[PDB]
Amino acid sequence: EGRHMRVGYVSTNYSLGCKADKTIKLSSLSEERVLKVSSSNLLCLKNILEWNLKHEILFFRISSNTIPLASHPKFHVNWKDKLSHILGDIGDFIKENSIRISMHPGQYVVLNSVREEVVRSSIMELKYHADLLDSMGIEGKIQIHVGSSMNGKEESLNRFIENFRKLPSNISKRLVIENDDKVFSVKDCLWISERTGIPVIFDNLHHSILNNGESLNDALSLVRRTWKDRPMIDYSEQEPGEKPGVHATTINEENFRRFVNEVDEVDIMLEVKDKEISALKAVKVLKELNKL
DNA sequence: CGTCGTCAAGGACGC
DNA sequence: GCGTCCTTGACGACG
DSSP string, A113-133: -SSHHHHHHHHHHHHHHHHHH
Upper half-sphere CA count for residue A60 (Cβ side, 13 Å) = 30
- Nucleic strand B within 7 A of Cβ A289: no
In angstroms, rounded to a whole number, what is the distance separating the alpha carbons of residues A66 and A42? 7
Helices assigned H by DSSP within A8-152: 31-54, 79-82, 84-96, 116-135
DSSP state of A230: P
Residues, CB < 7 Å to strand C? A 10-12, 19, 21-25, 27-28, 33, 61, 63-65, 103-104, 106-107, 245-247, 271-273, 275
**Contact residues for A114 (Cβ-Cβ < 8 A; gap 6+):** A148, A150, A151, A159
Q: CB of A50 within 8 A of CB of A95? A: no
- Nucleic strand B within 7 A of Cβ A63: no
In angstroms, rounded to a whole number, what is the distance separating the alpha carbons of residues A209 and A188? 15
* Dihedral sign for Cα atoms in the order A258, A285, A105, A175: negative
Residue ranges of the binding site of A: 178, 203, 234, 271
Q: CB of A261 within 8 A of CB of A235? A: no
- Nucleic strand B within 7 A of Cβ A120: no
Resolution (A): 2.7
Upper half-sphere CA count for residue A41 (Cβ side, 13 Å) = 24
- Nucleic strand B within 7 A of Cβ A125: yes
Q: Beta strands of chain A (E only): which ranges?
A: 5-10, 59-62, 100-103, 141-145, 175-178, 200-203, 232-235, 266-270
In angstroms, rounded to a whole number, what is the distance separating the alpha carbons of residues A22 and A67? 9
Per residue in A49-79, is it b (16+ CB within 10 Å) or e — as a string? beebeeeebbbbbbbbbbbbbbbeeebebeb
Closest listed residue to residue A237, CA positions, set A272, A261, A213, A202: A272
* Dihedral sign for Cα atoms in the order A106, A28, A40, A44: negative
- Nucleic strand B within 7 A of Cβ A74: no
CA of A289 and C1' of B1: distance in angstroms?
Answer: 49
Identify residue A137 by its one-letter amino acid code.
G
CA of A19 and C1' of C15: distance in angstroms?
Answer: 27
Cα–Cα–Cα angle for A186, A192, A193, rounded to 5 degrees: 85
DSSP state of A105: -
Distance, CA of A229 to chain centre: 16
Taking each continuous run of H as one helix and of E as one strand, the counts in chain A are 11, 8
Q: CB of A281 within 8 A of CB of A253? A: yes
Closest listed residue to residue A218, CA positions, set A263, A249, A172: A263
Which nucleotide is nearest to A112 if distance is taken from CA to C1'? B10
Task: Give, rounded to a whole angstrom, the gap between the first and last alpha carbons of chain A.
Answer: 11
Distance, CA of A292 to chain centre: 20
In angstroms, rounded to a whole number, what is the distance separating the alpha carbons of residues A282 and A270? 9
Per residue in A20-42, is it b (16+ CB within 10 Å) or e — as a string? bbbebeeeebeeebbbebbeebb
CA of A85 and C1' of C9: distance in angstroms?
Answer: 31
Helix (H) or strand (E) holding A191: helix A186-196
Which nucleotide is nearest to A275 if distance is taken from CA to C1'? C8
In angstroms, rounded to a whole number, what is the distance separating the alpha carbons of residues A291 and A279? 15
Q: CB of A202 within 8 A of CB of A179? A: yes
Per residue in A182-193, is it b (16+ CB within 10 Å) or e — as a string? ebbbbebbbbbb
Pairing of strands A200-203, A232-235: parallel
CA of A217 and C1' of C14: distance in angstroms?
Answer: 57
Identify residue A141 by its one-letter amino acid code.
K
CA of A118 and C1' of C7: distance in angstroms?
Answer: 19
Q: CB of A26 within 8 A of CB of A69? A: yes
In angstroms, rounded to a whole number, what is the distance separating the alpha carbons of residues A60 and A140? 10
Closest residue by C-alpha to C1' distance, nucleotide C6: A107
Q: Which CATH superfamily is domain A1-292 in?
A: Divalent-metal-dependent TIM barrel enzymes (3.20.20.150)
Nucleotides of C under 7 A from a protein CB: 6-13
Which nucleotide is nearest to A22 if distance is taken from CA to C1'? C10
Instruction: Find residue A103's DSSP bridge partners.
Output: A62, A142
